[PDB]
Amino acid sequence: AVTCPTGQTTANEACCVLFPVIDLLQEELFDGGECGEEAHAALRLAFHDAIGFSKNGGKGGGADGSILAFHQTETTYAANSGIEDIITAQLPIFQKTNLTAGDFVHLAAAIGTGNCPGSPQLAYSFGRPPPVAPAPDGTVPEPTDSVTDILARFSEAGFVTAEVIWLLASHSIAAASKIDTSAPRTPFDSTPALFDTQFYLETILNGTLLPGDGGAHTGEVLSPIAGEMRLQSDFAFAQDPRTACLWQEPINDQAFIQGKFFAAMKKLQVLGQTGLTDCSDVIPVPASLPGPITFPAGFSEADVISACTATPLPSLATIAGPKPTIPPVPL
Ligand code: HEM
Ligand SMILES: [Ca+2]
Ligand SMILES: [Ca+2]
Ligand SMILES: [Zn+2]
Ligand SMILES: [Zn+2]
């Protein structure tokens, strides 16, 4: 019900100002629409930003962009290690806009995630007011935290157990650079450029290795594949009685995870916010997956630990060379 300077059509004139910002992001941040490090980092940033929130107060203003506006404070916390890199890349591009910090952070994550084939078209609201103060320390879960502690933290923000697992489909387009300091950008699945369910499957393969210097760095546990990092907390969720059957649910069920991730993200990116305008039609529709998921080369069902023997895991093909090595996400 309107048409904007740059041409495109929308439901509200307020949404018209988002189209130049989306070009600035794709050019100057996402290396021309890639599902690379900066796309992944933008998603991570949105979570770290939004989880500075508690329904009972005292833990920050939520999805307010506090992590951008007050980064000198928040990027000094341990649990935010590596965030400073994202902030440094986002801050100059932010300044070429008149958005609030919250509206920028969460649009960058909506756009970046969509550069990943297989991801759901994410909702995007805007009109967030400026963040007031930095979140306090300790709002961001750490991979050594217990399952109990992590689910408790999420509850405070307003999320149930299942939603925590669906939110972790993010790790399908994700890597670690602060655990293995000599091995930056080590992915958590085989296909960090694709938002598929590979992640869920490769985390239940038997852990036999350690990547990089082959040593036990603190937040990681044994990985099934060379070049792949497995977080201690991801493996905890994958094996824990409370969550192991939820963990297997998405495998090769792309539509299942698309809806669950779309809905949990819709809530996450508005935590602590009220009174926003819907602008989801500015958000590009991400490409689809070129085909269903397959076992990595040299793996089969033989290699899985089923903590959910209540459900037959779905059959799937298995590319055949030798067991591969996954390179780091590019820079
Ligand atoms: C549930 C508890 C979670 C824990 C313990 C956790 C932990 C971690 C850790 C340790 C890293 C690697 C940091 C580094 O060393 O570079 C990471 C990366 C990442 N996290 Fe999670 N995370 C959690 C939940 C989430 C959620 C809810 C989202 C978003 C929906 C998310 C999105 C990401 C992304 C995209 C990355 C990759 C960043 C990049 O490659 O640049 N995480 N996470
Ligand atoms: Ca925040
Ligand atoms: Ca993936
Ligand atoms: Zn900085
Ligand atoms: Zn390591």
Residue numbers in the entry: 1 to 331
Publication text:
ApeLiP was successfully crystallized in the orthorhombic P212121 space group containing one molecule in the asymmetric unit. Its structure was determined by molecular replacement, and refined against the 1.85 Å diffraction data. It consists of 331 residues (from Thr1 of the mature protein to Leu331, only lacking the C-terminal Arg332) and contains one heme molecule, two Ca2+ ions and two Zn2+ ions. The overall folding is mainly helical, with 14 α-helices, and one short antiparallel β-sheet. Four disulfide bridges (Cys4-Cys16, Cys15-Cys279, Cys35-Cys116 and Cys245-Cys308) contribute to maintain the protein conformation together with the above Ca2+ ions, which are coordinated by Asp49, Gly63, Asp64 and Ser66 (Ca2+ at the heme distal side) and by Ser172, Asp196, Thr191, Leu194 and Asp189 (Ca2+ at the heme proximal side). Moreover, the presence of two structural zinc ions on the protein surface, from the crystallization medium, contributed to the folding stability. The heme pocket also includes conserved Phe188 and Asp234 on the proximal side, along with Phe47, His48 and Arg44 on the distal side, the two latter putatively involved in heme peroxidase activation by H2O2. The second channel is smaller and appears located directly on the heme propionates, occupying a position equivalent to that of the Mn2+-binding site in MnP and VP enzymes. However, the Glu37/Ala41/Ser177 residues identified at the ApeLiP channel are not compatible with cation coordination. The crystal structure also presents a solvent exposed tryptophan (Trp166), as the one reported for oxidation of bulky and high redox-potential aromatic substrates including the lignin molecule.
